[PDB]
Structure 1
Amino acid sequence: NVAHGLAWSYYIGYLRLILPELQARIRTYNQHYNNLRGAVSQRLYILLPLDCGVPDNLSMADPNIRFLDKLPQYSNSIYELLENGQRAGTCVLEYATPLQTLFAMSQYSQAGFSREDRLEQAKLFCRTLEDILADAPNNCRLIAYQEPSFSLSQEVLRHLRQEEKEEVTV
């Protein structure tokens, strides 16, 4: 069951190293984006395409997701989200790199690892990660989505607004 370990290693070996510093860096940044003319969500957003298809470049993949800026120090990028050519949201967005690992396996013959299997481990990966995140010492949402009526910018824009509702409320 490879997903169990990929999840842990991604957390222990990556997430728990950037996320502490995260919301500071974003806060530090956000001053100027205010002055220059918007805000950047405080959570890191992670794309979990259950297809395990990670583009080498996210912006070219979805038209409505333009690159905007690199966040100052670990390499993180601020994307703007679009509606009608209008800036509609802005966050730090990333792909869960361990999917690349599940995808390479399903193209590795001696692995005997099928797409059947890969989708299964993908969901498992997503599940187990979420649990890890639950007990961890909130600046980090998981966005699992099965490519089909579906705009990726919209799924992201959805969470994005839900984040701002929770802030002004609680």
Structure 2
Amino acid sequence: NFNVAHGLAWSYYIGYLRLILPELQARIRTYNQHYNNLLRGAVSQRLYILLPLDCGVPDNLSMADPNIRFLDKLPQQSNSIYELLENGQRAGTCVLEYATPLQTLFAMSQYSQAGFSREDRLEQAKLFCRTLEDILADAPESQNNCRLIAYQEPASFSLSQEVLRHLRQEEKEEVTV
């Protein structure tokens, strides 16, 4: 009984993703048309959503990994395009952001009146990802312009490598079928 993640996932979809995802692919499409000659290649058309299961969302992506560098702004019709580095070389680019409702789960774990433990938090974080994936599976503003990147960090970790893996898998899918 009592899972905050249910409502967090539904509200993130209804009050956010549903609104920005269609036309997100249109600002990336437009961007690619306009700027492909400056851009060595293209930006993935999907929004990449980081879901760290520890619920740790920093104010700047590069703080989590120096191999993730801000590249440019996606013009409106806030979203930033990031470059992913391997040995100082650009290995990929994409629109990246953390799933904001994970900050609620973290804030709750530090709020004592909630009776919400770090153990509860991890469990609700996983539940958030599961519920959100289910929602996006049947949504018209499809999964197809959105990808969930859920990861549990150990106790060294490369977030950029984690993202690069999804990018490379996505391109494989695109060209195989």
State the match for 1:91 in structure 2.
94
The superposition leaves residues 1-57 of structure 1 with CA deviations (integer Å, 9 ceiling, x where unpaired) of: 100000000000000001111111101101244204221001100000000000011
Q: In terms of mean alpha carbon deviation, does 48-57 or 22-31 score higher? A: 22-31
Q: RMSD of the TM alignment (CA)? A: 1.2
Deviations 1:123-150 (A, max 9, x none): 0000000000000011100000011153
Deviation of 1:74 (Å): 9.7
Contact 1:45 1:91 in 2 (8 A): yes
Residues 18 and 74 of structure 1 are in contact (CA less than 8 Å); yes or no, is this contact kept in structure 2?
no
TM-score by length of 2: 0.93
Structure 2 unaligned blocks of 5 or more: none
Rounded to whole Å, the distance in 2 between the matches of 1:113 and 1:6 is 15
Judging changes above 3 Å, is the alpha-carbon distance between structure 1 residues 150 and 9 closer, same or farther for their aligned structure 2 residues? same
**Cα distance in 2 for residues equivalent to 1:74 and 1:84:** 35
> How many Å separate the matches in 2 of 1:165 and 1:49?
24
Runs of 4+ off more than 3 Å: none
Distance 2:27 2:172 in 1: 22
Q: Which moved more, 1:144-153 or 1:3-12?
A: 144-153
SS of alignment partner, residue 78 of structure 1: strand
- Decide whether the 8 Å contact of 2:109 with 2:116 is kept in 1: yes
Asked if 1 retains the 8 angstrom alpha-carbon contact of 2:84 and 2:93, the reply is: yes
How big is the shift at 1:163? 1.1
Match of 1:32 among 21, 24, 34: 34
Paired with 2:63 and 2:86, the residues of 1 have a C-alpha distance of 16
CA contact (8 A) 1:51 1:147 kept: yes
Secondary structure at the counterpart of residue 81 of structure 2: strand
User: CA separation in 2, counterparts of 1:97 and 1:74?
Assistant: 23
Alignment of 1:21 onto 2:23 = yes
The DSSP-based 3-state class of the residue aligned with 2:21 is helix
**Could you say which residue in structure 2 is the equivalent of 1:6?**
8
Tell me if structure 1 keeps the 8 A contact 2:4–2:124.
Answer: yes
Asked whether the 8 Å contact 1:7–1:128 carries over to 2, the reply is: yes
Does residue 155 of structure 2 align to residue 143 of structure 1? no
Pair 1:161–1:37, CA change in 2 (3 A): same
Q: Could you tell me the TM-score, scaled by structure 1's length?
A: 0.96
Q: Judge which range, 42-51 or 145-154, deviates more.
A: 145-154
SS class of match (1:158): helix
- 1:152 and 1:74 mapped to 2: Cα distance? 30
1:73-126 deviation digits (Å, cap 9, x = unpaired): 191110000001000000000000000000000000100100010000000000
SS at match of 1:147: coil
